[PDB]
Write a protein that binds this ligand. Structure first.
Ligand SMILES: *[C@@H]1O[C@H](CO)[C@@H](O[C@@H]2O[C@H](CO)[C@@H](O)[C@H](O)[C@H]2NC(C)=O)[C@H](O)[C@H]1NC(C)=O
Lengths: 50, 49
């Protein structure tokens, strides 16, 4: 038995239709970085997000 | 005869860097302003970039 709460996720799709990976928005500074930069891989640098 | 003279020259280099936000500057603490900006879309993310 689990619990559900509303937030935003970012999803990456594939040409076959099935989703292969996903990431959330507010769990870690890296997760927030991926959520705000609209990308999965993050290059080294300074990022003002929120 | 020759003489030596000095002359000043001033050129600006850079100004103070300023950064703004739509979430705080446009609306203070109301979540309704956030709701309207999120339903309208991303208008100032390019301005932040
Ligand atoms: C070139 O001109 C300068 C001044 O514009 C001369 O310097 C002065 O020269 C007089 C005598 O010629 C001295 O009494 C002063 O004390 C000098 N001023 C200083 C040392 O600040 C300089 O002598 C001239 N040079 C030549 C080759 O004529």
């Amino acid at each position: 038995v689990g619990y559900l709460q509303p937030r935003t996720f970012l999803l990456k799709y594939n040409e076959n239709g099935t989703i292969t990976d996903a990431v959330d928005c507010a769990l870690d500074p890296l997760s927030e970085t991926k959520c705000t930069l609209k990308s999965f891989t993050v290059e080294k640098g300074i990022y003002q997000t929120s | 005869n020759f003489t030596i003279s000095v002359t000043t020259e001033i050129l600006p280099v850079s100004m103070t860097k300023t950064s703004v936000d739509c979430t705080m500057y446009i609306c203070g603490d109301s979540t309704e302003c956030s709701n309207l900006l999120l339903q309208y879309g991303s208008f100032c993310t390019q301005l932040k970039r």
